[PDB]
Structures are given as structure tokens and as C-alpha cells.
Design an enzyme around this catalytic site. Sequence first.
Site, PDB file in Angstrom:
ATOM      1  N   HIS A 152      -3.055  -5.581   2.498  1.00 39.37           N
ATOM      2  CA  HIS A 152      -3.822  -4.528   3.173  1.00 39.37           C
ATOM      3  C   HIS A 152      -4.578  -5.331   4.296  1.00 39.37           C
ATOM      4  O   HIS A 152      -5.900  -5.169   4.515  1.00 39.37           O
ATOM      5  CB  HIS A 152      -4.796  -3.781   2.146  1.00 39.37           C
ATOM      6  CG  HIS A 152      -4.292  -2.518   1.871  1.00 39.37           C
ATOM      7  ND1 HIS A 152      -3.586  -2.696   0.701  1.00 39.37           N
ATOM      8  CD2 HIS A 152      -4.500  -1.137   2.224  1.00 39.37           C
ATOM      9  CE1 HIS A 152      -3.280  -1.209   0.214  1.00 39.37           C
ATOM     10  NE2 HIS A 152      -3.746  -0.480   1.183  1.00 39.37           N
ATOM     11  N   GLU A 170      11.059  -6.982   3.886  1.00 37.50           N
ATOM     12  CA  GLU A 170      10.219  -5.932   4.487  1.00 37.50           C
ATOM     13  C   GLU A 170      10.551  -4.397   4.589  1.00 37.50           C
ATOM     14  O   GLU A 170       9.574  -3.609   4.664  1.00 37.50           O
ATOM     15  CB  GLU A 170       9.972  -6.376   6.030  1.00 37.50           C
ATOM     16  CG  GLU A 170      11.337  -7.101   6.472  1.00 37.50           C
ATOM     17  CD  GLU A 170      11.267  -6.887   8.185  1.00 37.50           C
ATOM     18  OE1 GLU A 170      10.663  -7.818   8.543  1.00 37.50           O
ATOM     19  OE2 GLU A 170      12.207  -6.203   8.416  1.00 37.50           O
ATOM     20  N   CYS A 219      10.571  -4.130  17.578  1.00 36.93           N
ATOM     21  CA  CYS A 219       9.840  -5.026  16.827  1.00 36.93           C
ATOM     22  C   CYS A 219       8.762  -5.631  17.071  1.00 36.93           C
ATOM     23  O   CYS A 219       7.762  -6.115  16.384  1.00 36.93           O
ATOM     24  CB  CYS A 219      10.933  -6.009  16.312  1.00 36.93           C
ATOM     25  SG  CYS A 219      11.395  -5.618  14.589  1.00 36.93           S
ATOM     26  N   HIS A 260       4.441  -2.799   7.377  1.00 39.47           N
ATOM     27  CA  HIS A 260       5.333  -2.521   6.212  1.00 39.47           C
ATOM     28  C   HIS A 260       5.119  -2.560   5.029  1.00 39.47           C
ATOM     29  O   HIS A 260       3.835  -3.123   4.605  1.00 39.47           O
ATOM     30  CB  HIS A 260       6.842  -3.611   6.178  1.00 39.47           C
ATOM     31  CG  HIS A 260       7.562  -3.615   7.630  1.00 39.47           C
ATOM     32  ND1 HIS A 260       8.311  -2.753   8.090  1.00 39.47           N
ATOM     33  CD2 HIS A 260       7.217  -4.613   8.474  1.00 39.47           C
ATOM     34  CE1 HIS A 260       8.699  -3.194   9.383  1.00 39.47           C
ATOM     35  NE2 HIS A 260       7.966  -4.419   9.721  1.00 39.47           N
ATOM     36  N   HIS A 287       2.032  -6.145  11.168  1.00 42.02           N
ATOM     37  CA  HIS A 287       2.563  -7.609  11.764  1.00 42.02           C
ATOM     38  C   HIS A 287       3.368  -6.995  12.907  1.00 42.02           C
ATOM     39  O   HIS A 287       3.576  -5.669  13.086  1.00 42.02           O
ATOM     40  CB  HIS A 287       3.395  -8.161  10.773  1.00 42.02           C
ATOM     41  CG  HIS A 287       4.779  -7.814  10.668  1.00 42.02           C
ATOM     42  ND1 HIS A 287       5.922  -8.593  10.589  1.00 42.02           N
ATOM     43  CD2 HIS A 287       5.493  -6.718  10.880  1.00 42.02           C
ATOM     44  CE1 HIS A 287       7.069  -7.987  10.556  1.00 42.02           C
ATOM     45  NE2 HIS A 287       6.836  -6.892  10.803  1.00 42.02           N
ATOM     46  N   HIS A 332       2.972  -2.546  14.252  1.00 42.99           N
ATOM     47  CA  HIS A 332       3.754  -1.663  13.210  1.00 42.99           C
ATOM     48  C   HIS A 332       3.425  -2.315  11.787  1.00 42.99           C
ATOM     49  O   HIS A 332       2.668  -3.107  12.042  1.00 42.99           O
ATOM     50  CB  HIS A 332       5.314  -1.509  13.532  1.00 42.99           C
ATOM     51  CG  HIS A 332       5.979  -3.016  13.338  1.00 42.99           C
ATOM     52  ND1 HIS A 332       6.353  -3.595  14.400  1.00 42.99           N
ATOM     53  CD2 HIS A 332       6.608  -3.434  12.079  1.00 42.99           C
ATOM     54  CE1 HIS A 332       6.812  -4.606  13.624  1.00 42.99           C
ATOM     55  NE2 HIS A 332       7.050  -4.528  12.456  1.00 42.99           N
TER      56      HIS A 332
HETATM   57 ZN   LIG Z   1      -2.897   3.169   3.917  1.00 45.10          ZN
HETATM   58 ZN   LIG Z   2       8.548  -5.580  11.279  1.00 42.12          ZN
END
Ligand SMILES: [Zn+2]
Ligand SMILES: [Zn+2]
Lengths: 118, 118, 117, 117, 118, 117
Positions: A70, A109, A26, A32, A15, A30
Site C-alpha cells: 500500500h 505483477e 506502462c 498492481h 508504480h 498505474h
Molecule cells: Zn485500495
Molecule cells: Zn506496471
Amino acid sequence: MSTTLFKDFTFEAAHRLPHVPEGHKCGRLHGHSFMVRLEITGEVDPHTGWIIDFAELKAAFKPTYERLDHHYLNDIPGLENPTSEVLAKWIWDQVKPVVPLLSAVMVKETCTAGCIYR
Amino acid sequence: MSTTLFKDFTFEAAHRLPHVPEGHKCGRLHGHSFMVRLEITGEVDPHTGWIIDFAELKAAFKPTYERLDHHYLNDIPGLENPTSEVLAKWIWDQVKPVVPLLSAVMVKETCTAGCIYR
Amino acid sequence: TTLFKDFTFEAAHRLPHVPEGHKCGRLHGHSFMVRLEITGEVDPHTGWIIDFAELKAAFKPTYERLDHHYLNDIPGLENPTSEVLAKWIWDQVKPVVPLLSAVMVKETCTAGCIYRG
Amino acid sequence: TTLFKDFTFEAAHRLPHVPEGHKCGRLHGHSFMVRLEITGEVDPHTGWIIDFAELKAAFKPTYERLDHHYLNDIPGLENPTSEVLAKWIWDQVKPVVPLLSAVMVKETCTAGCIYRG
Amino acid sequence: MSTTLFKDFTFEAAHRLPHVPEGHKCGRLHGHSFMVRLEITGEVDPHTGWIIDFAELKAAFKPTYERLDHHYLNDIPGLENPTSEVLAKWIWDQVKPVVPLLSAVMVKETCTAGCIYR
Amino acid sequence: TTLFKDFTFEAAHRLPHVPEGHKCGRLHGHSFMVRLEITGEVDPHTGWIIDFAELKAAFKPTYERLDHHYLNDIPGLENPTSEVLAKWIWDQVKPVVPLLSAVMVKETCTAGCIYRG
Ligand SMILES: [Zn+2]
Ligand SMILES: [Zn+2]
Ligand SMILES: [Zn+2]
Ligand SMILES: [Zn+2]
Ligand SMILES: [Zn+2]
Ligand SMILES: [Zn+2]
């Protein structure tokens, strides 16, 4: 006095935050290992000894699950600003209609940081 | 209905209990890997999608953090009786003034044992 | 085949030989984790290398010396790093638990040290 | 004697060379754990093989390259499996931390990979 | 505002569910590493700095503990249907009489799944 | 290079060959953790030693034999200690997963056993 029940799922997505000041870590792409906690409240059927099934809970969640696991969250309509606060609610909103007993939703997260909508 | 948010810090100090009966393990000098949980409640700015920042939360806590981390607690005025109950409150008291949204504070001295002040 | 058992104990220490006003030099404490691990053959009948209760008892002395104590007070623990400390533990237990093969100590959740052999 | 330190960083990746519409091929992310572990002798005086703060600093460059980033962008990380990725990390750090002996990476809580030596 | 305290025990038993449809995994004999959380609420004695002891809490629980640890749950009168919901209550019921401050009981049969009775 | 995957399964067992009214001899149960770990070279193209999904499938038979079951019923598991049990698992999987190098089993959170090789 009352009984509540609760179930943990985890999932993997990427996200980014659209509205953070330009430097912010942020707002870079990236991801989580999110954790989500559904919690239900209600009565305990005296025969099953259950608030509800779970097989029934899992499968009711599953389509909502599959859409996040995913996957990249900003592409899901509703999650253009995939914050914990916004996401926790986004879930409530999808699953409350199919799980009337939904009491509260929790989104973590990181290990160390989360959010609880009611 | 309402959204609460929550953040975990850990820290390392030594403490002892002044008022335990003479044998008690707990009144010998010892220490712990404490964990603290700040929790805030409030509204979710519709632009940031946040109850609040975090960078802003961290830094507001930090001076209070630094006073406890890698320190002996009985030397901090207020914590002459560094119990979880007393400590959880001691924090509330330092940070509630600089974090009005502070909803509740949690202190765990072991993995298996904690305290929540409101 | 190896077994391993885990213990937390709760204690204080400061490191004497550390720079200026470095933060590990201020008297602090941690929740420590100790893992004894041992290697031998299983008894063809018990299915065990050892009890886990034979273990517990053989440790218990050293264990209550550390739990809820200050470490620098303990002869051989002037300078209680993880490294000093895991080794020190090994020296106490290897006599009472000859099968013992590693000792692992963790100060915090994310750091740690193994003293093998 | 071995020490080991642990870090989480938070990132995105997709695997390019994976079948059809297999789910690891969709751009996803994980919370990753990296464990550097190192082997040497303790200083007879400090009681340390290294600080843990000497470590931190020597990693920090590589660390901020990965934390909160997308991995496929990073030269040498086209194809960021755990295996590629642990090795890649090893190649960056072994120069700056010669004592370093393993690198362990975990995508999820339950899977993981060690690149030794 | 108020302080609550909380203590975790774990224990090992086998159980099975009497009333699940015939196939269900859950009605086969099996077992778990259960976790239980007692939680108490009350005032903080200004001398001890404690809601209560713990040594005193442990030992008050202990006989109830011992009956479950390393045991089969369906043989304990009250637990013929050893569900989390039924079990969490079963505890409340045994310990509430000897721990008046008992605020709530929590039972987790897996890492990822639990129950809170009040 | 080694990979490792982790599974919990939920089961009952009692130990037959244990003293008097020792508490492990009463029919109890645990939440068990099994870790298969395997060693091989990565495919220069996939970046993988194995899937993690190739693994899952190859285990799945043995896995559903144990999950939600009573262990003493299972031929070769009369006497289900961690040691017996990790070995037993190894015997089932080594045929279907030749790269497999360790099997680790944990009864509780704090005890455990590795059956190497
Ligand atoms: Zn993976
Ligand atoms: Zn994040
Ligand atoms: Zn204490
Ligand atoms: Zn220290
Ligand atoms: Zn069950
Ligand atoms: Zn057992």
C-alpha cells in the site's frame, strides 16, 4: 538430493516506468496486485522437521514487506525504475542479508507475467 | 547469479491422439483450454531495466499463436500427434528461431497437468 | 440453503451460425466448467441436502457423454453455445435431480453463463 | 439466463476520506477484476444473448480509461472505493449495454463488491 | 536439451506437529486441503509421443494416494511428524520405487506455501 | 449493493452420521474458504458500507475458534457438514454484523455451500 521450501506474499502498490517511449501505457501512473515468492534451500533439522520456522521467515521479511505494501514504489530508494526485473532484485538485496538461506525471489505483477532472480 | 522472465498465454483448440489403444478417451475428438508459458533468460539492459520488451515478445509469438488459437491441431504440419510433449517442442521450434533468449516452453492442457521442454 | 458442485470436462465444438470466417466458426475446443447447484432443506439428521456422491452418480451419464467428446455430434447440441449448452444440460439433469436450481457453464476462465430455473 | 464476462485492468488509487495515516489513504494500486453480467433471452437462431465481442467493443472506451491509469483523476472517481467504482462503471455502461444487470469489482483476490441494478 | 512432465493431485487430511513449542497453532489438531505434484523426467517414446502413460502413473500412485486421502497423517508410519518437508520426502520414498522416472515431488499444504524434494 | 470478504482457515473434522466405512467418516481435514457477504447502503461520504477492517475485527473471535482447530469439539459442530457449518457461522456473526446477508463455505476447491438469510 535436496529440499527447497517456498512462501507467497501479495501486496498492493502503484508504480510507473521512467524510461519507456513516450506513449507507452506502462509509463502512465498505474498500479498492481503484486505477488512475491521467497524460496529457500537448506537442510531439514531432524527435530523440527523444518528447513526453517516461517514465523521467523515472515517477521524477517515484514519490515521489507511493509515498505512496499500500500505504497508508491518509485519513492523507495532503489526502485526509481520499478520494473519486475529491478524489483525482484531489490528484494533479494534487502532480504538475502537477513535470510541467508534465500535461494531465489519471484515477482509477478499480473496473473500472467513474472520474474525470478537468483 | 541470473534473472529469468516469463509470460503466459492461453488458447483454445481441439486435438486428438492418433496412437492411443482403441478405447482410450484420448483418441476420441475432443479439445482443451491450453495454457502456454514462454520463459526467457538473459541480461537486464541497465537503461530499460528489462530483459526484453514484451510488446516485442507478444508480436514475435503472435503468428505462431494465431495458428493454434481456435483451431484443430492435427491439421498443423508438425502436430499430427498433438501431445503435450510434442506440442511444447513444436512451439520451442517455431519461436526459438525468432526469440533467441527462449529459455524453456511450458504447455498445460488441463489445470492439473503439464509439460516443460528446454 | 443452496449447495453447488463443480466439474471440468474437456471437449470440442464449433458454432455453425456465425459470420464469414469468424474464429468461433473454426472447429476449436475448450476446457469447460459445469456447476450444478441445488436448493432444498437439510435433513435434520444427516446435515445434508444430498450426498455430493448421490449427485456425482446422477450426473455421471450426461457427464461422460460430454467429456472428451465433440459436441456438435450430440442431438440437441447442433449449435453448442454456452447458452444452448447450459440449457441442454439442465434438461438432462432436472429430471434426475429435482432439487437442482441452476446450471452454470464456463468456456474459458473469464466468460460464462448461468441458466436458472 | 444470464451471461457474464470478466476483465482485469491495472491501476492506482488512494482514498481521500480515510483516518489519520490509515494505509488505504497512502497512494497505492491494485489489479482489479470487473465482471459485467447481463440478462436477456437467447436469439432462437444465434443461440446468443449477445456476442461477447459486441460486449468487448461497447466497454472498450471505459475500459482503456481505467486500465493503466490513476483513478482519482477520473471525474466521478474522487473517492474510488469498490462501491463508488462499481456504481460509476454501471453508469457508463448501462447506457451502451441496456441488457446489463450487475457490475462486480474486486480490488484484491479476497474482497469484492456487486452493484446490482 | 530435455523434457519433463508433471501431474497434480489434491487430497484431504488432518495432521498435527509433535515438536512445536507449546502454544503454536500448528501443534493443535487441524487439517488441510493438500496438493501434491509429481514430476517426471525422461525420453519421449517416438510412437506414443509420451514420456509415460498417466493411467499407468495414476494407478502407480493410487495406493500411496489412498493411504493419505481423507485420513490422519500421524497414524501412517513414517509421518509421525507430518511436516511438508517430511511428507514430500515420505512420498518420494513410496513412489520413487514404483516410478523410476520420478524427478521431484511437491507438497503444498496451503495455497500460499509449499515444498519441493528431489 | 453488496460487499463480500473471503477467508481461508485450516481445520479437521469427521462426519459422525455417515455409512459403514464411508470416507468422510474417517477423521480428515480440509482448507476451508468462508465468505461473508453483506448488504446495505454506502455512506454518502465514506463511500463504504463498512470498512473490511470493521468486519475482520467482528469476525476475528469466531475465526480463531475455527482456524487450526478440530471442529467436532466445537459446541454446535457435532456433525460439521458444510451445511451445518455455514449455518453455525451465520448464527455467530449475524448478531455482531447485522448487515450480513449470506455465508458461503467451501470444503474443497470444487464443492461448496451458501446459507442465505
Ligand atoms: Zn485500495
Ligand atoms: Zn506496471
Ligand atoms: Zn487431450
Ligand atoms: Zn467456443
Ligand atoms: Zn498444518
Ligand atoms: Zn469433509
